[PDB]
């Protein structure tokens, strides 16, 4: 019954048409977006066609009072193909022409921006260790997990937050869900390029100090990771979030090493070891 999913998205039921137009256009699925555009496209040409007929027989080589001919003319026009069979006749015809044109291009201008706006979304090539572990490092138990960059490009002034979420009681006895930042031995990495193992020493200041497994389940406590940085690939900021549940903490585990020396004597990164955690089994 987790508040937060693994993908980091909160897991709640929300209780609530043209109001949020811009958001909605960037939020819709590509199929839909393309449809909408199409609809709009067809629609407006039809409208324009009617305008033509309305004037009445103002297009060269158009079957009299036929909406198709006018429509297709309108596309050839708006789109500025301007084949040349169907042509404006008389001031009224042409004014509508020079109006459509402008309309068409403006639409392109609007479509473009939407496209570009929705199209230009980078994604940190970042991979999260499927598990956390609690184990002794430098003489104090420490909670860790690790990120691997999935691309050759580097992430600059990357940094990460390790947030514990769990239930608490106020002195007043309000029983709420609280967020605790957890101090990391290293929270900034100005140049993140291969792997980073993040650590929260556990000492008298850690909100998870002297806590067993039993106690963690009991506060229904999870761990939320937010990573962010400036990706050289995109020359644009990127982020990535992940969440862990009490039971994805492997007590005493140790992340295996992904750094190797080749036969060649050249260093290397093996991603295969990335999700592997060493463990002592005591029968």
Sole binder of K ion in the list 65, 82, 91, 190 (CB under 5 A)? 82
Instruction: Please give the residue whose beta carbon sits closest to K ion in the complex.
Output: 80
DSSP codes, 53-83 = HHH-S-BTT--TT-HHHHHHHHHHHHTT---
- Give how far Cα 154 sits from Cα of 88, 235, 261, Å: 57, 10, 22
Per-residue HEC secondary structure of 189-230 comes to EEEECCEEEEEEECCCCCCCCCCCHHHHHHCCCEEEEEEEEE
H or E element that contains 130 = none
Min. distance of Cβ 67 from K ion in angstroms?
23
Choose among K ion, its own copies, none what residue 101 binds, the Cβ cut-off being 5 to 8 Å by kind. Answer: its own copies
Asked if 18 is part of the footprint of its own copies (rule: CB under 8 A), the reply reads no
Question: Closest by alpha carbon to 132, among 145, 119, 114, 121?
Answer: 145
Say how many Å lie between the first and final Cα of the chain, rounded.
Answer: 32
Burial of 115 per CB tally in 10 Å (0-12, 13-18, 19+): middle
Least CB distance to K ion at residue 71 (A): 18
Establish if 241 lies at the interface with its own copies (CB under 8 A): yes
Q: Cα 33–36–42 angle (5° rounding)?
A: 140
Residue among 51, 92, 125, 252 that touches its own copies (CB under 8 A) = 125
Does 151 sit near its own copies (CB under 8 A)?
A: yes
Q: How far is the CB of 255 from K ion (least distance, A)?
A: 59
Smaller CB separation from its own copies, 26 or 54 = 26
Query: Alpha-carbon distance 134 to 155, whole Å?
Result: 27
**Residues between 31 and 50 that touch its own copies (CB under 8 A):** 34, 37-38, 41, 45
Number of residues engaging its own copies in binding (CB under 8 A): 107
Look at residues 68, 97, 92, 62 and name the one whose alpha carbon lies nearest to residue 81: 97
Among 28, 92, 115, 277, binds its own copies (CB under 8 A): 115
Site residues (CB under 8 A) for its own copies, limited to 193-212: 193-194
* Broken C–N links (> 2.5 Å) in the chain, after residues: 16
Among 35, 56, 65, 181, binds its own copies (CB under 8 A): 181
Q: How far is the CB of 26 from its own copies (least distance, A)?
A: 6
* Span of 48-56, 211-219, 244-252, 268-276 interacting with its own copies by CB under 8 A: 268-276
The entry of K ion, its own copies, none that residue 22 binds, CB within 5 to 8 Å by partner kind: its own copies
Among positions 17, 31, 64, 174, the unique one binding its own copies when judged by CB under 8 A: 174
Q: By CB under 8 A, what part of segment 95-114 binds its own copies? A: 97-98, 101-102, 104-106, 108-114
Residue closer to its own copies (CB basis): 18 or 262: 262
> Does residue 278 belong to the site contacting its own copies (CB under 8 A)?
no
The answer to whether the CB of 59 falls within 8 A of the CB of 93 is: yes
Q: Which two tokens stand for residue 8?
A: 């980091």
Q: Is 127 in the site for its own copies (CB under 8 A)?
A: no
Least Cα distance to 105 among 69, 73, 77, 68 occurs for 77
For binding to K ion (CB under 5 A), which residues are involved? 80, 82, 84
């Amino acid at each position: 019954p987790r508040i937060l999913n693994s993908d980091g998205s909160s897991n709640i039921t929300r209780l609530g048409w043209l109001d949020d137009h811009y958001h909605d256009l960037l939020t819709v699925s590509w199929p839909v977006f393309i449809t909408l555009i199409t609809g709009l496209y067809l629609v407006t040409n039809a409208l324009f066609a009617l305008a033509y007929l309305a004037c009445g027989d103002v297009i060269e080589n158009a079957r009299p009072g036929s909406f198709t001919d006018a429509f297709f003319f309108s596309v050839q026009t708006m789109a500025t193909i301007g084949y040349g069979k169907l042509i404006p006749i008389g001031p009224l015809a042409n004014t509508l022409v020079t109006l459509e044109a402008l309309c068409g291009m403006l639409g392109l201008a609007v479509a473009a921006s939407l496209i570009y706006a929705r199209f230009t979304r980078p994604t940190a090539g970042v991979l999260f260790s499927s598990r956390m572990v609690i184990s002794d490092f430098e003489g104090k138990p420490t909670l860790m997990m690790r990120l691997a960059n999935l691309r050759i490009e580097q992430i600059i002034e990357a940094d990460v937050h390790l947030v514990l979420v769990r239930s608490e009681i106020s002195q007043e006895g309000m029983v709420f869900r609280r967020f605790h930042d957890l101090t990391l031995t290293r929270s900034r990495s100005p140049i993140f390029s291969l792997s980073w193992t993040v650590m929260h020493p556990i000492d008298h200041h850690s909100p998870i100090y002297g806590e067993t497994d039993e106690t963690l389940r009991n506060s229904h406590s999870e761990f939320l990771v937010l990573f962010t940085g400036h990706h050289e690939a995109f020359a644009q900021n990127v982020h990535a979030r992940h969440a862990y549940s009490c039971d994805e903490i492997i007590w005493g585990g140790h992340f295996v090493d992904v750094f190797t020396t080749l036969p060649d004597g050249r260093r290397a990164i093996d991603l295969g070891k990335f999700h592997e955690i060493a463990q002592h089994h005591h029968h």
